[PDB]
Amino acid sequence: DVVTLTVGATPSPHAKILTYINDNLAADAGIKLDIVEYTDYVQPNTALNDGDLDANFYQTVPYLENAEKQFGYNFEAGEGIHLEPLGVFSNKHKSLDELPDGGTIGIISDTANQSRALELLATQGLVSIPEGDVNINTVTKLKNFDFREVEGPQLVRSLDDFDYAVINGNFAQEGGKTISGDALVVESPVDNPAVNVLVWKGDSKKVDAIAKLEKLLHSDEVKQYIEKTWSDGSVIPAF
Numbered sequence: 344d345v346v347t348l349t350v351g352a353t354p355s356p357h358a359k360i361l362t363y364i365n366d367n368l369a370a371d372a373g374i375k376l377d378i379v380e381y382t383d384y385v386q387p388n389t390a391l392n393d394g395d396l397d398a399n400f401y402q403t404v405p406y407l408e409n410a411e412k413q414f415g416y417n418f419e420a421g422e423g424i425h426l427e428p429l430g431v432f433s434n435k436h437k438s439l440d441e442l443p444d445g446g447t448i449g450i451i452s453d454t455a456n457q458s459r460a461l462e463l464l465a466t467q468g469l470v471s472i473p474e475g476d477v478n479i480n481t482v483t484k485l486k487n488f489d490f491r492e493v494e495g496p497q498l499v500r501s502l503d504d505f506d507y508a509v510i511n512g513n514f515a516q517e518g519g520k521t522i523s524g525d526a527l528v529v530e531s532p533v534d535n536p537a538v539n540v541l542v543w544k545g546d547s548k549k550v551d552a553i554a555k556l557e558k559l560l561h562s563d564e565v566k567q568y569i570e571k572t573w574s575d576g577s578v579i580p581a582f
């Protein structure tokens with residue numbers, strides 16, 4: 344009666360953290376992990392919904408709340424494990440002030456993350472968000488440039504085409520990039536609601552096993568693994 348759990352995860356940090364747990368902690372907890380790596384945001388929630396995964400570990404609390412609102416998903420989430428500060432990246436400039444007149448900024452296409460990237464740009468004086476649904480058509484541009492919506496896994500590649508791109512940590516990681524080494528502008532980690540959580544479906548038969556994985560993901564061992572593995576500011580424990 345060891346329970347096996349199929350968990351979907353983006354490769355870095357999430358699959359790495361899950362692999363540390365699998366290889367170091369799962370056996371003592373009486374669980375086995377079957378890690379499935381995913382490279383986009385749509386697919387792990389669909390697989391959790393449709394019955395292919397027991398849990399996923401890739402998404403932020405605000406993205407989850409939006410997915411439940413837009414799609415009706417019946418999911419349950421755990422405590423914040425870690426934060427990935429959002430960054431503005433570029434291969435053409437080292438300062439956002441060098442945004443050419445009619446220049447371009449790549450921006451993700453999902454609601455929650457486009458909204459978060461738009462806020463980050465507001466802290467830099469580049470867009471104005473009305474007080475009160477935040478997207479490229481509802482913000483006011485305060486300098487002359489164009490946004491270009493790009494699908495998440497195309498963000499790092501879009502740096503070849505555009506002056507800048509706003510890029511979530513998991514994608515920056517895939518592209519060999521770090522916050523310390525490569526972010527032009529770094530989202531503040533203070534009072535940041537975009538913590539990453541374990542998500543499972545409300546009716547799982549495996550809730551004893553998933554509560555064990557939740558406890559392992561918020562252990563001192565996992566915090567130390569995160570702090571040892573990422574000291575470049577790209578992945579910060581949220582506990």
Ligand code: MET
Nearest residue numbers: 384402403406427511513
């Ligand atoms: C799928 S919501 C964004 C998740 C991403 N790993 C982040 O923390 O920004």
